Paper text:
In this study, we determined the crystal structure of DHS from Pyrococcus horikoshii OT3 (PhoDHS), with NAD+-bound, at 2.2 Å resolution. Similar to DHS from other organisms, this tetramer is a dimer of dimers with a point group of D2, generated by two local 2-fold axes that are perpendicular to each other. Interestingly, unlike human and T. brucei DHS, PhoDHS contains only two bound NAD+ molecules and shows a difference in the NAD+-bound and NAD+-free monomeric conformations. Two bulky electron density blocks shaped as NAD+ were distinguished at the interface between molA and molD of the PhoDHS tetramer after several cycles of refinement and were later assigned as NAD+. Those NAD+ molecules were naturally captured during the expression of the enzyme in Escherichia coli, since no NAD+ was added during purification and crystallization processes. The two NAD+ molecules (NAD1 and NAD2) are embraced individually by molA and molD of PhoDHS in a sandwich binding manner and insert their ends into the pockets of molA, and molD with 2-fold symmetry. Bound NAD+ is proximal to a loop (V288–P299 (hereafter named “the binding loop”)) that displays very different conformations in each monomer of the PhoDHS tetramer. Notably, in molA and molD, observed to bind NAD+, the binding loop adopts two different conformations (right): in molA, the binding loop positions away from NAD+ (conf), while in molD, the binding loop adopts another conformation to access NAD+ (conf). In the molB and molC of the PhoDHS tetramer, where NAD+ is absent, the binding loop is disordered or only partially visible. Strikingly, our structure presents a simultaneous combination of three different conformations at the spermidine binding site that are reflective of a three-state conformational regulation of DHS by NAD+: the apo form, the open form, and the closed/reaction form.
Hypusine (N-(4-amino-2-hydroxybutyl) lysine), an unusual amino acid, is formed by the post-translational modification of a lysine residue with the addition of the aminobutyl moiety from the polyamine spermidine. The hypusine modification of eIF5A is catalyzed by deoxyhypusine synthase (DHS), followed by the hydroxylation of deoxyhypusine by deoxyhypusine hydroxylase (DOHH). DHS catalyzes a NAD+-dependent reaction that synthesizes deoxyhypusine (N-(4-aminobutyl) lysine) by transferring the butylamine moiety of spermidine to a specific lysine residue of eIF5A. Consistent with archaea sharing a requirement for hypusine for the function of translation factor aIF5A, both the modification and DHS gene homologues have been identified.
Numbering used by the authors:
A (entry chain C): 15 to 121, 124 to 289, 311 to 336
B (entry chain D): 15 to 120, 131 to 300, 312 to 336
C (entry chain A): 15 to 121, 126 to 305, 312 to 336
D (entry chain B): 15 to 289, 312 to 336
Amino acid sequence: EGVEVKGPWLDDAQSLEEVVSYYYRIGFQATHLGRAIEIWRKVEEKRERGEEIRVFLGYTSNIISSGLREIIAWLVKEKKVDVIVTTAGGVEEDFIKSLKPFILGDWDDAELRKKGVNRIGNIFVPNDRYIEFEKYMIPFFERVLKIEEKLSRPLTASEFIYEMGRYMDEKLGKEKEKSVIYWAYKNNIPIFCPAITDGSIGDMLYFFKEERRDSRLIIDIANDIVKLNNLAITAKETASIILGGSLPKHAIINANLFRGGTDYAIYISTAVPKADYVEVWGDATLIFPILVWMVMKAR
Amino acid sequence: EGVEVKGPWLDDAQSLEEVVSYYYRIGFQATHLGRAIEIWRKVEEKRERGEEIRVFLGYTSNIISSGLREIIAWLVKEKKVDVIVTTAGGVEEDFIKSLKPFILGDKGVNRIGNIFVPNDRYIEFEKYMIPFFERVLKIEEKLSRPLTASEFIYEMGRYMDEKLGKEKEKSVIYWAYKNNIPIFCPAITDGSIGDMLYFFKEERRDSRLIIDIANDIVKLNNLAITAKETASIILGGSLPKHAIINANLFRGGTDYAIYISTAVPWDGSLSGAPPRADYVEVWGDATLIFPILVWMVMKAR
Amino acid sequence: EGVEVKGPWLDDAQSLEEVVSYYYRIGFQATHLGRAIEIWRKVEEKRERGEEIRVFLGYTSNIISSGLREIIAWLVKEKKVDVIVTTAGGVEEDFIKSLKPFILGDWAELRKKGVNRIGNIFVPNDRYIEFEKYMIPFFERVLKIEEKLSRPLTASEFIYEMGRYMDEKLGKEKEKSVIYWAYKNNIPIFCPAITDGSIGDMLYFFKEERRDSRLIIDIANDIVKLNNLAITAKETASIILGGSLPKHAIINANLFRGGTDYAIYISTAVPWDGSLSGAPPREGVSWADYVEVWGDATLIFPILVWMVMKAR
Amino acid sequence: EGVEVKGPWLDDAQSLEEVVSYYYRIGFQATHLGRAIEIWRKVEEKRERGEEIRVFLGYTSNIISSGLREIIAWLVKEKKVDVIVTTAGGVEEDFIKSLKPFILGDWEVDDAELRKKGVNRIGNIFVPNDRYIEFEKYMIPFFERVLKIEEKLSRPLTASEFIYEMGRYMDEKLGKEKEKSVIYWAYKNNIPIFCPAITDGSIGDMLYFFKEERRDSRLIIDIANDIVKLNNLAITAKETASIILGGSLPKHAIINANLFRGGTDYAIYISTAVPADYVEVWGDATLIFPILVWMVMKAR
Ligand SMILES: NC(=O)c1ccc[n+]([C@@H]2O[C@H](COP(=O)([O-])OP(=O)(O)OC[C@H]3O[C@@H](n4cnc5c(N)ncnc54)[C@H](O)[C@@H]3O)[C@@H](O)[C@H]2O)c1
Ligand SMILES: NC(=O)c1ccc[n+]([C@@H]2O[C@H](COP(=O)([O-])OP(=O)(O)OC[C@H]3O[C@@H](n4cnc5c(N)ncnc54)[C@H](O)[C@@H]3O)[C@@H](O)[C@H]2O)c1
């Protein structure tokens, strides 16, 4: 006799946490979210007992476009993860949100182009967000170039993003305290982004280089692979928490290839594709807040 | 809308419900679940002031295969919905679960995703269905007319009441019979009930046990027409989503709609058709979405 | 070793059929379509040599809404399938298309204009008004037949009589109709929820205006009918477009014989097991002629049918 | 009120091409594929009559894993596209396939047995381990050549120059099999291949061993100067067309490069991700793309 499939009886359940504790028994994806909760509960309890599991967190730009950005930022502030891989949008949107917020719209594209509003699903980014971002990135580019001139070597993408967090601390106010990039800098959590020029930052850098005839500002990706892979190899155990697919999933999986794979994995994805590995199929905005709370906060 | 996109800061949030209270301003599907909570809350307060809103609840068999069955039954027990349309699996698996439970999976075992239904579940179901068929035929001879599918399912709850003990009180069919909530299922013979009916008819050379579907369209369509307002809560696609939407065309459309499904429209399908500030679709597995939605509507404050 | 993954070289490929003959070694869903072509070619050749394989064809309403309607009708005309299971829309829209065509639109004020939208397909309201002029006399014939026999028709008998009605009342248009050719060629069409659509809508009006409770459509006796068709066959094959009731009914019927002997499933629904998984078309079977092709049938099915039936 | 929804009648239709010529009026995704055929025929016919339309081709690694690799290579050989954006897998699997083919993973093998045998599984496609050993045989000397070029120029190569040099290297060291390679024909036809995350894959894995064992930090792959090259190719064009298979970095990069000019002038997207010179065909590109290319480029 195996585990009985049963949902919560709502006359007896006393909290939403209690409802969610039944998810491992509900079946389908609820069962997967239930398994994810208690895979991460091990890793977190094991970490708090001084056991070394290096936690790799990967996400695509939609994660940062959404309100999950604040949950990611908290995870980094509280040192719940050790290594981040994301996309160009995952970096720049975290910075931009520290300047002006994104706005909830509705999933009239011709009107949006006329009004200069960038739409991400049902989330709107007005044009002045990118102008404000340029005001900060152009001086950041000059600083990166001077650092490279002083070092006589290019910065890697992760060093670039590390320097971004240092730059955020110097130039921004209280808004930086909900920033992933800021807390990664403060807690020395590297952020890898092998395609950091594929977005607004790259567009900024295009104008900087076109205006100033610069070819000396270099972003290297060859030396980050050593840094990322070594972080997986030198760990006694690794865990993978990957939201979405694309470059971050592939990079984290590929990095853990060398040590024979990650030792624990939680995948959350809408892309149709032991007890220590699970994928939850669904939108991370629905799933991730419940997962984090049940692992980090639930009593 | 125009609200700033923002997630909860977990240094401040006190409970999971407060976390979920941010969903409307999180973006993507979280925003859709946030709007679904607002919609059903609005309908549920209006019902509690005595405002007539006829709630049509539709779901496919996978909902009943999952632990959501207990949540559906509670919603039926507490009269949160007025009309049910489901599929054959949605009916017969609710009965079967009141005899033996489904087993969580990764020898004659029926697998539904990661859910196991061992063969003795259906063997036990037949021990109840064969006498029930005899009762249905005896009813139809007494009435000199066939039972419609909803009448057949109502009679199935009465039979559950007489023949079963405690475990019927987690059952959707039982509570629908107890509360006189009609369950429509115009393809009731599509699964296990059909299989044993097949055995029943071969065994007794019977062609007199008739299940009519022509008269339930009057019953279901009139339930949509006669109400002042209707609300449509639909899990999945297929026959139930189509029947509830089709029934509500006779009144010009439902007044509130919450659809939860994993299907998409680009195959052109009903299951993927969109819900048309009182209409919303949440894309995802209902076993993840529905318990959050019901709790925040029926028990959050 | 094994089959080398390889696409056609377009300096050498002479025809689209030659391009498609590479699909089995292209990988992903293209490999599955290649396997589906091989499976149905096998079934069709065995049938043409006199071996008995009862072919079950299932499809959802969308198949008939789309231009696949003409391809299904040709399959039924040529008796490439023996049994059909569909939904209410799959029946009624085939009849309607014999009266007035569906119109190509785009994927929302159509409601005041009285235009029903199915994806990027438009059905103007006069299609249903015209359909009603035919259904009301048909309902009256159905009632007379049921009074004559003192028994109700099943859905399959109802649909068979619909085809006889089309033969009597229509001209050349019926020659593109699934319902006409199924009646004409003695191919049963099962539809266990035939009231869930426009037929049921007009039956509601017919029942309301006449205060009728006597027009009965039975579903309990077709399951004997449908299940015996699967049991008595020496072999069966299941070609199923989409999900819902038709997929479940054909698989459920074939449970009684230990599962179908050949299966080709085409659906946009992502099975739990995987889009590339073996298991999806292997369900309900108890024993390598099983394949699922993931995608829109309007893309896949015309290629499959041509390569199986017409490519030389 | 418009076009009548109608499929082909198989008593009349004489060819598969004739069957596919009904796709525009079949509805759903068939209609989108018919529209994609019309759009690309328009682009191609304009190009054949001298009109400047810069064609950006984007695809993810699954495209090159599959048999579509031969079709992409033909498009590049015949100069049907002007700019390529792909991923690391899209680059390195094209090179590997010129060494040893990929194998159809037709049977059911559990991944534990696959890993014992050293077989990498990509969907239903198998890459046996000796493919990567043979790849390393060629990539280590290529790394050494790249470093010498960098020392010679006193500057790093960008990713697109790296891939261009990969094509030159293929032409020097490989035989007839290179004639079915995207990288080779892009080099011969001076078609740039952009890949802003070229180290996230097998090339990156071998560079790791190269750098780790040689304590090298001098071999650089720059991406800052490629965004200039790519964006200029879109801004300097009179008109642009985008043909994008799948999502990920290539789709984002091509859309981003066309942002400055108000977007591409024609777009054909083919993807499985759930979202009149612009169309998306929802489905597997291995099903759709061979039909689209034949009907655009060869159906007469
Ligand atoms: N036009 C209409 O959709 C229409 C009209 C009248 C009646 N109805 C009624 O709607 C009810 C429910 O719809 P249904 O059962 O016909 O199917 P459905 O619309 O519920 O679709 C079921 C599944 O079929 C698959 N599918 C749909 N289109 C596909 C395609 N082009 N290619 C591949 N797979 C595809 C998908 O997995 C989908 O989830 C039925 O009772 C039917 O009679 C529908
Ligand atoms: N569970 C079983 O194995 C079983 C048993 C007996 C009978 N049946 C019969 O199976 C037939 C066909 O199945 P059906 O009509 O119940 O549904 P279906 O298989 O037609 O599913 C239709 C749609 O439901 C949606 N869906 C499925 N699971 C979902 C989930 N967890 N959350 C959200 N959306 C979800 C999908 O988008 C899908 O396209 C019915 O006639 C039923 O009686 C099923």
